[PDB]
Design a protein around this motif. Structure first.
Motif, mmCIF file in Angstrom:
data_model
loop_
_atom_site.group_PDB
_atom_site.id
_atom_site.type_symbol
_atom_site.label_atom_id
_atom_site.label_comp_id
_atom_site.label_asym_id
_atom_site.label_seq_id
_atom_site.Cartn_x
_atom_site.Cartn_y
_atom_site.Cartn_z
ATOM 1 N N UNK A 69 0.851 -1.222 0.000
ATOM 2 C CA UNK A 69 0.000 0.000 0.000
ATOM 3 C C UNK A 69 0.850 1.221 0.000
ATOM 4 N N UNK A 70 1.920 1.235 0.821
ATOM 5 C CA UNK A 70 2.808 2.419 0.889
ATOM 6 C C UNK A 70 3.386 2.787 -0.431
ATOM 7 N N UNK A 71 3.840 1.755 -1.131
ATOM 8 C CA UNK A 71 4.443 1.946 -2.402
ATOM 9 C C UNK A 71 3.457 2.521 -3.432
ATOM 10 N N UNK A 72 2.295 1.923 -3.520
ATOM 11 C CA UNK A 72 1.322 2.345 -4.518
ATOM 12 C C UNK A 72 0.804 3.736 -4.197
ATOM 13 N N UNK A 73 0.663 4.083 -2.918
ATOM 14 C CA UNK A 73 0.196 5.431 -2.544
ATOM 15 C C UNK A 73 1.180 6.477 -2.969
ATOM 16 N N UNK A 74 2.463 6.157 -2.802
ATOM 17 C CA UNK A 74 3.546 7.031 -3.211
ATOM 18 C C UNK A 74 3.564 7.187 -4.695
ATOM 19 N N UNK A 75 3.343 6.097 -5.409
ATOM 20 C CA UNK A 75 3.286 6.137 -6.852
ATOM 21 C C UNK A 75 2.074 6.932 -7.359
ATOM 22 N N UNK A 76 0.893 6.699 -6.816
ATOM 23 C CA UNK A 76 -0.275 7.459 -7.250
ATOM 24 C C UNK A 76 -0.036 8.935 -6.930
ATOM 25 N N UNK A 77 0.631 9.228 -5.820
ATOM 26 C CA UNK A 77 0.870 10.621 -5.472
ATOM 27 C C UNK A 77 1.725 11.322 -6.515
ATOM 28 N N UNK A 78 2.844 10.683 -6.846
ATOM 29 C CA UNK A 78 3.833 11.261 -7.713
ATOM 30 C C UNK A 78 3.426 11.245 -9.173
ATOM 31 N N UNK A 79 2.653 10.239 -9.578
ATOM 32 C CA UNK A 79 2.306 10.110 -10.976
ATOM 33 C C UNK A 79 0.955 10.748 -11.391
ATOM 34 N N UNK A 80 0.078 10.910 -10.411
ATOM 35 C CA UNK A 80 -1.304 11.259 -10.656
ATOM 36 C C UNK A 80 -1.723 12.395 -9.785
#
Length: 558
Positions: free
Chosen positions: A244-255
């Motif tokens: 979850x941490x990883x994907x949240x960081x990714x959605x934050x930075x990418x989207x």
């Protein structure tokens, strides 16, 4: 940085867009002045793009810092989990925008292998790549209003595969986090009657109450990249699985923090550096960012003992009056601080000293008497936009029915009881579709209700008093009267004449239809029935209806 940059390609429509309410007997009976009614369209999208495009300068201070620290400490106590693909698929609205990769909402909902495998692909890419900006589409919303024409709102959203992934990562956080960081101030936890009780109790708690609403100019545009990364840091303060941490960081930075926008014809239209209005976290994020900024601004401004109610970008604050001139000064000070935090005003706030005159989410508290002669308080609003949308939807059916949402939120009001219920129960009877589930929007989410269950729904949310209110306030009656005249609707007396027939028709159909006639339309008869509690209402669980929504209302329950 600029909220938006534009390449100069236009914001384009998908298919035809109707601008005007047609002249039809089924809508004419509700209101005659059809030329006053319009829908927004892509024709005005450039006017809105101008308004939402501007440079943000944010300057933070010690008051913001201390609020933020409190918030992260509160977020520490939340633990959350990921949703399964099946669970996120069930949250997908049946009419959600289709994917460009060959499937739509129907396929997501049925768990088609194509849709499911696609969404697993998207998930794996968010785990692997934490930086490449994700494409979004920009569209002009088609929304109906009465002339007072406003330009269309713009919606920016990612592909359906991405939208399911966002739910998988953040839906559980969204159910827990707002209440844990804001407690009573988080406004979406409250049903209408619970909102009323909150406000009455807050107002009553002050020796000399003063309230104000704060209207941020284009709140989503004022959210900075730093604000969005701060939201992330709040989600990461929770106890989460590493995945979850990883994907949240990714959605934050990418989207979340920004990205490229494409129009409906596939042309590059621009680049966003502000909040996207059609992402899952739009409502939770705006509510959190508003709260933090607002609470810090109260402290900057010397507002004394603030009680806040925050619902996304909408804010109301009730506090102790410090005198007429000093309230005026303190609200100016609150405005300067908000402006430093990058939440500049649209309408300037003004001190209000009568609770009925305070608007939260376009709604206000009003009072009437029930059948035992007790004062009862209820939530109401200006009925113009609800009646205009009811007229449009009578002739152009929408997959989501605003009139049903209005009946449920505003059931105790005179304008729902006499006009909307009468008009729509007549239509349902004519179509013989009383017993058919319909979808509606409540607090940023889509639900399904059977009209025949309305009496229990209303009793549960609003009490039996909702079927017997009388002796409404002159503010309230003036506003309803003014709307009927503006729209060319029949007068309330004519709605009573009509309702007497609808009531009879309902009673004669028997069974649940007859409960609808007897309870919903008791106001319409001379010899009133003695209404007793409905056993089903006592057993209904409706809490699930009052949550933070999703951006664009793109979440569906049950």
């Amino acid at each position: 940085s600029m909220s938006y940059t534009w390449t100069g390609a236009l914001i384009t429509p998908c298919g035809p867009e109707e601008e005007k309410l047609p002249i039809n007997p089924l809508s004419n009976s509700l209101m005659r002045f059809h030329n006053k009614v319009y829908s927004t369209t892509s024709r005005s999208a450039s006017l809105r793009a101008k308004k939402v495009t501007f440079d943000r300068v944010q300057v933070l201070d010690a008051h913001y810092d201390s609020v933020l620290q409190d918030v992260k400490r509160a977020a520490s106590k939340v633990s959350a989990r990921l949703l399964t693909v099946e669970e996120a698929c069930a949250l997908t609205p049946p009419h959600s925008a289709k994917s460009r990769y060959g499937f739509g909402a129907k396929e997501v909902r049925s768990l088609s292998r194509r849709a499911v495998n696609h969404i697993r692909s998207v998930w794996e890419d968010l785990l692997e790549d934490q930086h490449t900006p994700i494409d979004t589409t920009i569209m002009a919303k088609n929304e109906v209003f009465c002339i007072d024409k406003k330009p269309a709102r713009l919606i920016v959203y990612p592909d359906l595969g991405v939208r399911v992934c966002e739910k998988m990562a953040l839906y559980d956080i969204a159910q827990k986090l707002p209440k844990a960081i804001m407690g009573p101030s988080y406004g979406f936890q409250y049903s209408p009657a619970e909102r009323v009780d909150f406000l009455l109790k807050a107002w009553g708690s002050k020796k000399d109450p003063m309230g104000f609403s704060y209207d941020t100019r284009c709140f989503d545009s004022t959210v900075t990249e730093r604000d969005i990364r701060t939201e992330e840091s709040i989600y990461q303060a929770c106890s989460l699985p590493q995945e979850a941490r990883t994907v949240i960081h990714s959605l934050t930075e990418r989207l979340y923090v920004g990205g490229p926008m494409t129009n409906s014809k596939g042309q590059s239209c621009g680049y966003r550096r502000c909040r996207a209005s059609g992402v899952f976290t739009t409502s939770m994020g705006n509510t959190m960012t508003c709260y933090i900024k607002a609470l810090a601004a109260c402290k900057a401004a010397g507002i004394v003992d603030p009680v806040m109610l925050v619902c996304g970008d909408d804010l109301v604050v009730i506090s102790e009056s410090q005198g007429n001139e000093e309230d005026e000064r303190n609200l100016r000070a609150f405005t300067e601080a908000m402006t430093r935090y990058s939440a500049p005003p649209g309408d300037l706030p003004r001190p209000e000293y009568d609770l009925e005159l305070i608007t939260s989410c376009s709604s206000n508290v009003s009072v009437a008497l029930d059948s035992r002669g007790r004062r009862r308080y209820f939530l109401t609003r200006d009925p113009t936009t609800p009646i205009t949308r009811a007229a449009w939807e009578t002739v152009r059916h929408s997959p989501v029915n605003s009139w049903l949402g209005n009946i449920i939120q505003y059931a105790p009001t005179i304008w729902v009881r006499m006009v909307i219920m009468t008009h729509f129960f007549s239509i349902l009877l004519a179509q013989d579709t009383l017993n058919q589930n319909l979808n509606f929007e409540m607090y940023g989410a889509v639900y399904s209700v059977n009209p025949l269950d309305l009496p229990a729904i209303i009793e549960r949310l609003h009490g039996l008093e909702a079927f017997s209110l009388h002796t409404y306030s002159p503010h309230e009656l003036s506003r309803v009267a003014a709307t009927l005249r503006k729209l060319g609707a029949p007068p309330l007396r004519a709605w009573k004449s009509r309702a007497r027939a609808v009531r009879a028709s309902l009673i004669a159909q028997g069974a649940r239809a007859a409960i609808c006639g007897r309870y919903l339309f008791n106001w319409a008869v001379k010899t009133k029935l003695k209404l007793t509690p409905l056993p089903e209402a006592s057993r209904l669980d409706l809490s699930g209806w009052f949550t933070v929504g999703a951006g664009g209302g793109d979440i569906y329950h049950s």
